[PDB]
Amino acid sequence: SGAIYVGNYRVVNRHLATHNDWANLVWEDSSRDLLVSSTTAQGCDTIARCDCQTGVYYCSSRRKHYPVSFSKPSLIFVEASEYYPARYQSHLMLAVGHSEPGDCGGILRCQHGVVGIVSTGGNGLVGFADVRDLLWLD
Numbered sequence: 001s002g003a004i005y006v007g008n009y010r011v012v013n014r015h016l017a018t019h020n021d022w023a024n025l026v027w028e029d030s031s032r033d034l035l036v037s038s039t040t041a042q043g044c045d046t047i048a049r050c051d052c053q054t055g056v057y058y059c060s061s062r063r064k065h066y067p068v069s070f071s072k073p074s075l076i077f078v079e080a081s082e083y084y085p086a087r088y089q090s091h092l093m094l095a096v097g098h099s100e101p102g103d104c105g106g107i108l109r110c111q112h113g114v115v116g117i118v119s120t121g122g123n124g125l126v127g128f129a130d131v132r133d134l135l136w137l138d
């Protein structure tokens with residue numbers, strides 16, 4: 001679990017969005033596993049606008065943060081799950097690091113701000129949905 005709170009927006013994994021997220025929908029994209037909903041309170045986070053390929057992510061299954069080197073946002077095949085058929089997920093960044101399914105929503109940050117959230121993983125890999133291209137979040 002986890003979310004980004006920026007301005008009057010909440011950014012979550014689309015597959016973990018709540019009934020309230022869908023009732024206050026701003027934008028969603030199944031191919032990116034992202035959903036953005038509107039909030040009444042002002043958010044605590046700021047978004048990176050950069051080309052960093054290193055950063056630190058929060059891993060809830062270890063209660064710890066880990067440093068990572070990650071690939072540039074790309075189209076990656078993701079196997080079927082209970083949430084989606086087998087498909088290509090876009091704007092995904094992969095890295096070597098521990099993750100389990102419930103780690104989705106953990107934030108990846110570089111020195112500039114929030115880069116994205118955990119969205120995929122397996123066998124010593126962790127994948128992050130990029131948010132740096134969503135300029136309207138600002």
Ligand SMILES: COc1ccccc1NC(=O)N1CCC[C@H](C(N)=O)C1
Pocket residue numbers: 015033078081083084089099100101102103104118119120121122123
């Ligand atoms: C962090 O996720 C994992 C880690 C280790 C093992 C498995 C996972 N599950 C995982 O990759 N997905 C399940 C939920 C929806 C995901 C998606 N974006 O399509 C895919």
Ligand SMILES: [Zn+2]
Pocket residue numbers: 048049050051052110111112113
């Ligand atoms: Zn950066």
